[PDB]
Amino acid sequence: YQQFDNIYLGAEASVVSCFLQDSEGLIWIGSNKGLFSYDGYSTQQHFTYGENNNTRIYCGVIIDNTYLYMGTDNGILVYNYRADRYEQPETDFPTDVRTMALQGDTLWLGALNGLYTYQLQSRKLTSFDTRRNGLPNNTIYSIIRTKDNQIYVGTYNGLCRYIPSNGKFEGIPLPVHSSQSNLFVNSLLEDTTRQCVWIGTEGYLFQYFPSTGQIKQTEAFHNNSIKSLALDGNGDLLAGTDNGLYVYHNDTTPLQHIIHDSRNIQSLTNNIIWNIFADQEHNIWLGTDYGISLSRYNSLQFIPISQITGTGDGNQFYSLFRDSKGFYWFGGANGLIRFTDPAGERHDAIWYRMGDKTYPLSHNRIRHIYEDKEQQLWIATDGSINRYDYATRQFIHYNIVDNTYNTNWTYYIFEDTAGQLWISTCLGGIFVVDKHKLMQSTSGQYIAEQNYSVHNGLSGMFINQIIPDNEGNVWVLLYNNKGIDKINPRTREVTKLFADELTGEKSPNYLLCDEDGLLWVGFHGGVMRINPESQQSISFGSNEILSMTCVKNSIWVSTTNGLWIIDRKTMDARQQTNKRFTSLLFDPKEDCVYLGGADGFGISHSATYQPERPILLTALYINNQLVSPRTRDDVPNIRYTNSIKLKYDQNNLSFELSDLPYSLDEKNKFVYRLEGMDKEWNFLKSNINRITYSNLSYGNYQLIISKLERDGQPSNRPHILNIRILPPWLEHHHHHH
Amino acid sequence: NYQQFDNIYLGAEASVVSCFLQDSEGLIWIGSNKGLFSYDGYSTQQHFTYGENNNTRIYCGVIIDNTYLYMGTDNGILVYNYRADRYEQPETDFPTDVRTMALQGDTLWLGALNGLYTYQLQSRKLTSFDTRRNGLPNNTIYSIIRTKDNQIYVGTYNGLCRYIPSNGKFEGIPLPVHSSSNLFVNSLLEDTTRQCVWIGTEGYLFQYFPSTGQIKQTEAFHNNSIKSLALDGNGDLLAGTDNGLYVYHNDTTPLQHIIHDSRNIQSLTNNIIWNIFADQEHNIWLGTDYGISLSRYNSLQFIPISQITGTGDGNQFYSLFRDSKGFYWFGGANGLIRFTDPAGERHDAIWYRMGDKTYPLSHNRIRHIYEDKEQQLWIATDGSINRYDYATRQFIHYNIVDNTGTYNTNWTYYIFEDTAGQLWISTCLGGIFVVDKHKLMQSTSGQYIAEQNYSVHNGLSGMFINQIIPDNEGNVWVLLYNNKGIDKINPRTREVTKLFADELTGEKSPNYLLCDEDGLLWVGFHGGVMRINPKDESQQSISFGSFSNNEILSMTCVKNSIWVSTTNGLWIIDRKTMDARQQNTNKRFTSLLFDPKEDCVYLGGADGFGISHSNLATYQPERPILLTALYINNQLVSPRTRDDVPNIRYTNSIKLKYDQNNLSFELSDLPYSLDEKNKFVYRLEGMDKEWNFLKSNINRITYSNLSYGNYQLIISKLERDGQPSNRPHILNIRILPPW
């Protein structure tokens, strides 16, 4: 909170009382002169000088995913942000609305002269008062609904909570202070982690615990007023006051106190913080008595399973894989998910699981996913091995035994250069098997060509990974054992190596081959590089290894604690949130890395990975004047338009674009072109998001805008606007309403 | 209520029950002093053999990977694959004398008589926690739980502590007592509604509140110990002791205390309660020192939307409708949901809303759903009217204005089709529009001009119209918002008359309108209804209940009654006498639908809907039939005891030898929650020509002397009409020839 990006709406509209973010990410601003929006580049107004909508906004709520309800001196402005029109219902709203809170489909309204509910379907307006309902006072400043569906109402003289059964209100007994002749309750905030409601009053910050009724005084800010409360991305409590911002973490950590410095343009813009809003990306918006301070939240992007197929089922990911046809395969404890596009919208994921009607698996617990020499997809599971059939979209199951030990608990699979499948197990040792004959087999159970076991050379039969050498040798990772077994399949010679070094606590639990033929062995606090019989080790100092994968010249090592990145040639080690990741995948083509964990996965670069954001048109200008449905009947809301038809003399057009870059230090770069006029891409400077065209002839055009990709190439998913300029004779075809 | 139980006793001299599990398909499993059992609602079945290592006392269990029962024993952990019906031991050397188990993601916590352990299910790593290395108060562990916020609580021989994953140690939590030795902590239970952890010990029941560190001595029961804890469907805390069951509601409410009564075979079976388990249907299972006491749950059956769905999105339901093709259409404040079964078992809901990339709607606020004369589905919304296209699964939106171009159809409240191809559309602000249905459907204009409009200028009483309803007398009756009386339109002359304004006025201003099957009109107002006969324009009126100012939310015809949902509850009114009767739940329903096919009523409300029979017990959802036992020559057979037989519960196809031809099958639909059992019919294709009937107490099906060949056993619930259902259970049977 050391630096802020400060934002101003003009000299008239210096006071900001609230923020809303619509479900598509655009930020809305309630100022002392009316509503604005801010697209990350410039502000826009949505009122006309002189009109009833040119007025102080005190609060707002989004209704029906298409209306902004805003509290005003005169009642409630209802702004339809999709149509871009004020759409007043017939309702006689109470004047002076200062606070609002949705409960199901009833909107609670807190005003200077009363408390109300507004049922949204029937338009039924119900009033609540001191004399009938036992409210402590009629002037309302703050109303919230908690997760367990209780209503808290802060007033000019005290805090209470609604009692649905009898329609009355129960006081919460905040302390009465000799310095005050009434008990202002300015702000209320539910905190689900701390299990409290935070209460801001003049001079005192309280936590109310509904579990016990305890009212804890957490802070006293002498002679200061608490105006607003939010929780940031770390879950710290942010308190906006008349003397800057306070940040609370816990009882033993001192508050941060953040204030305006008149000689420093990057400081909090003003000390009087009327409102604080945490946006969908955890950016903190501070609304003040003089403009806005934005504090950007920065990074790894983490993606919950439910965003891929939702479905709120969980999964702990132990294997992540991308096939040569480009499907993602993410599995572990609870099944396998096939999907496309990790950081897109579409995904069309399929979940293969035990007991599914449509997509079954012999067992939920996936241990390995592998693509063979003929691009056939193999999985290892605790219900044996399976092979995918892409045409049927279903798995084919194989039972395997040796010539006498079996394959039910399979750990690892690979294909050798003679068309044999190598399979490691949790009891039956290692099986080696004719791939085509297994595939061609028709016997449900299948006798193995070969098997390695403790009877013929292995140390134990509890073995995880098996990895081929460049010179045909098979290196086996041994469970609860010392050293690593090594197999020459040419003369069946198994030998136990590095028992000297990899014993006791140096017991190995992970093993991989890099692109240069070097093995990396992970053990308790340290990794060790090998030439298959040379090389040695290193350690993590002041515990254990979950996953390792190669990333270029680096090997990434996921641990209980966090990540270690090692350079492959020197063996230099460097440590990098506190998430533990049980799975790692490097995607060379997209040049990112997937980090698989509990009920989700992260994505990061091989510099903080940026999620893909669609491109919006935020403003249309005709002959140099901004135009929208709010002011013109003959022009649509450009944000929600794919094709526009214009009159013949509406041929001087400007466009503003944005991908809503609120979180970003540096803006993305863009390219544009107008099909029907331009023959190539035009490049924009990153600070310029305006596109302009003059004196267009009649006919059809396509405006095409793309984000420049970080390799320099325009994206192939542009935003496209169809534009027809009508001749004089066809004028009556112009946009209308 | 806890005053009567269904008492269940186990075979094989087992009499002590120490735990219950319920698999993801609803079967109950029972750990007993002699080994593992299952119960299908008809009989108990053992899953162990006398003398074998599986014939052993079970102390606790959890289900792992949707296929195993991990169970604690003297020898460690007994692992049972319930799908394969085989004991399947891991290679892992487990500690002995396990007493408690709790999952944390993909790690299983194990508490034992001499240590605490972790077991990581992927790596199979076993990690030990102790007194010296970790600050445990004692190595004897009796209870372990994981809370929703992912904390680990461990109850021991000497007190309670909490895991610290920072440093891998345990923080003690001191328990305030009257004096002293070591405080046994036998039992732990998280309660998200009170936001505490309940703690049962010898002598006391505590609540600990992690948000503040407060610790409350909620009960003190000298010479009694708390052995088990659960919460019931009401959110009451149930405490199992060695002197019966205690039920806690709040501090001001007397505890209920429930004990055995030797003179009454429906009382609690035994006073020593080892485990209490609340099943998915909220039935309470009590495992005691002698048998099981089952307490069936009584409600209204309420279905939350997420059960439909599979998402946490809300909706307040204002229109329920089921179409001529059988699709249900439940819509309200937050869009419109299409789905085919009220229990959501087929996960095939489609949810239409504004903003949805795949299934958009012009507006989320649905005001009416209607099917026309040609089976086309129409909806009225605050974004005009739409028609469904079944083939594309998309709505088609229409914009309609009057001929002057002044009024439009943006805010549509109600729609119907008359007998002459015309759609009648009621609006807020634009009056009523009458539109030629086929011309609208075929229009390509993007604005349609209505043939007719009714408004304040040509006879209407106002411009805000809620509902418009045809007579059986050729008229259209019109409910206006906050007006006096109701308007009557004669569509042929276009005459508009205002009727019943003498009574329906001021506090009796109407706000609901409907026509019943006999063609009488029902008008709803604050705290009463009025029945109108449109033949003679006669009228009778009643008031019901209190208060006088008591709002009507929804009204619907249910056979010979009308159902009326209000702010203060549900009233049922007889259509001929007009006798009003109040019903009793606290939920308030803003939508109602009678389905004559299923003989039931849907009551739509906040984030879900109730289902009820028309004639009042409670309503039971259809459950699938399972096969739970196979007998050959009158001996029970399973993969556990034979090579050549599969798990009957998970097989669609069985292959038998020539001399395995005397067969019995037990069946169940898991009727745990039922006073009366259902009735079944069965037939064996290849043998039977007709259905056979069971008799409700009998769930066993027997065929003798089958000849080699192919058969198919079909089993079906006998429906309330006396028809078989169309969810039969099918088993293909092949009997092989001798050779």
Question: Can you give the three-state secondary structure of B173-192, one letter per residue?
Answer: ECCCCCCCCCCCEEEEEEEC
Name the residue among B357, B364, B606 with its Cβ closest to that of A65.
Answer: B364
- Chain A hits for B551, CB-CB cut-off 8 Å, are 124
Chain B contacts of A107, Cβ < 8 Å? none
Q: Is B230 helix (H, G, I), strand (E, B) or coil?
A: strand
**Distance between CA B431 and CA B424 in Å, rounded?**
11
Rg (CA), chain B: 32
Cα B33 vs. chain centroid, distance in angstroms? 33
- Are B354 and A426 a contacting pair at CB < 8 A? no
Answer for the pair B709, B732: CB distance below 8 angstroms, yes or no.
no
Sign of CA dihedral B301, B307, B312, B313: negative
| Smallest CA–CA distance from A313 into chain B, residue | B310
- Are residues B278 and B231 in contact, defined by beta-carbon separation less than 8 angstroms? yes
The Cα–Cα gap between A248 and A239 comes to 8
How far is the CA of B478 from the CAs of A306, A367, A529, in angstroms?
Answer: 47, 67, 85
Q: What is the DSSP letter of B13?
A: T
A67 touches B at CB < 8 Å: no
User: CB distance A582–B122 less than 8 Å?
Assistant: yes
Q: Confirm if A415 and A433 have CB atoms less than 8 A apart.
A: no
Determined by which method?
X-ray
Contact list in B for residue A105 (CB cut-off 8 A) is 316, 332-333, 606
- The CATH fold assigned to B300-615 is Methylamine Dehydrogenase; Chain H (2.130.10)
CA distance A122 to chain B (A): 9
A735 at the B interface (CB within 8 A)? no
Nearest by CB to B91, which of A64, A345, A462?
A462
Task: Show Cβ contacts of residue A477 under 8 Å, excluding neighbours closer than 6 positions.
Answer: A463, A464, A465, A466, A467, A484, A508, A509, A510, A511, A521
Give which of A206, A292, A415 is closest to A10, Cα–Cα: A292
**Alpha-carbon distance B588 to nearest alpha carbon in chain A (angstroms):** 12
Using an 8 Å CB-CB cutoff, list chain A residues near B334: 64
A294 with A286: CB under 8 angstroms? yes
CATH number of A300-606: 2.130.10.10
CA nearest to A274, candidates A27, A116, A57, A111 = A57
Which residues belong to CATH 2.60.40.10 in chain B? 616-739
User: Edge-to-edge, what's the strand order for the sheet holding A335-339?
Assistant: A317-322, A328-332, A335-339, A350-352
Contact (CB, 8 A) for B625 and B717: yes
Pairwise CA distance, residues B257 & B200, whole Å: 16
Going by C-alpha positions, the residue among B456, B474, B475 that lies closest to residue B465 is B456
> Do B173 and B180 form a contact (C-beta atoms < 8 A)?
no
CA distance B245 to B52: 35
Distance between CA atoms of A724 and A514, rounded to whole angstroms? Answer: 57
The highest-level CATH class for domain B616-739 is mainly beta
Residue A120's DSSP bridge partners are: none
CB B141 within 8 A of CB B99: yes
How far does the CA of residue A382 sit from the closest CA of chain B (Å)? 10
Q: Which residue of A has its CA nearest to B367?
A: A121
Check whether the bond before A19 is cis (ω within 30° of 0): no
- In angstroms, this model's resolution equals 2.3
Quick one: residue B491, left, alpha or beta (phi over 0 = left, psi -120 to 50 = alpha)? alpha
Distance CA B329, CA B338 (A): 5
Reported as type and span, the H/E element at residue A439 is: helix A435-440
Which residue from A82, A104, A479 is facing B606, i.e. has the nearest CB?
A: A104
Structural tokens at position A553: 């010249």
| CB distance B634 to B661 below 8 Å | no
B316 reaches A (C-beta below 8 A): yes
| B650 secondary structure, DSSP code | G
A712 φψ region: left (φ > 0), alpha (ψ -120 to 50), beta (else): left
- Contact between B493 and B535 (Cβ < 8 Å): no
Report which secondary-structure segment, H or E, holds A440. helix A435-440
By Cβ distance, the residue of B25, B195, B606 closest to A195 is B195
**Residue count of chain B:** 739
Closest B-chain CA to A733: B445
Architecture of domain A1-299: 7 Propeller (2.130)
Closest to B173 measured CA to CA, from B135, B126, B140, B221: B135
Domain with CATH 2.130.10.10 in chain A: 1-299, 300-606
User: Tokens at residue B447, please?
Assistant: 């604005």
The span from the CA of B183 to the CA of B185, in Å, is: 6
CATH 2.130.10.10 domain span(s) along chain B: 1-299, 300-615
**Breaks (C–N over 2.5 Å) after residues, chain A:** 299, 404, 532, 542, 576, 606
Residues of chain A with CATH 2.60.40.10: 607-737
Decide if A695 touches B, using CB distance below 8 A: no
Give the span between the Cα atoms of A109 and A115, in whole angstroms.
6
Q: Say if A426 is an interface residue toward chain B (CB within 8 Å).
A: yes
Q: Which of B106, B313, B346, B567 should be substituted to probe chain A, the one whose Cβ sees the most A Cβ atoms within 10 Å?
A: B106
Cβ–Cβ below 8 Å for B333 and A365: no
Q: What is the DSSP letter of A684?
A: P
Task: Pick the closest to residue A546 from A469, A502, A587, A598 (CA basis).
Answer: A598
Please, which residues 76-105 of chain B have a Cβ atom closer than 8 Å to chain A?
83, 91, 105
Name beta bridge partners: A97: A111
Best mutation target, B63, B66, B126, to test chain A (most A CBs within 10 A): B66
Cβ contacts (< 8 Å) between B91 and chain A: which residues? 426-427, 462
Distance CA A701, CA A688 (A): 22
Q: Which amino acid is at B337?
A: I
Contact A160, A128 (CB under 8 A): no
Distance set, CA A556 to CA A417, A515, A532, B687 (Å): 28, 14, 21, 66
CATH superfamily, domain at A607-737: Immunoglobulins (2.60.40.10)
Nearest to A327 by CA among A369, A364, A367, A381: A369
CA separation for the pair B606, A518 (Å, rounded): 61
Tokens 């935020």 locate to A618
Per CB-CB distance under 8 Å, the chain B contacts of A214 are: 212, 214
No. of H helices and E strands in chain A? Answer: 3, 63
Q: Could you tell me whether strands A519-523 and A526-530 are parallel, antiparallel, or unpaired per DSSP bridges? A: antiparallel
Torsion of CA B154, B155, B157, B158, to 10 degrees: 90
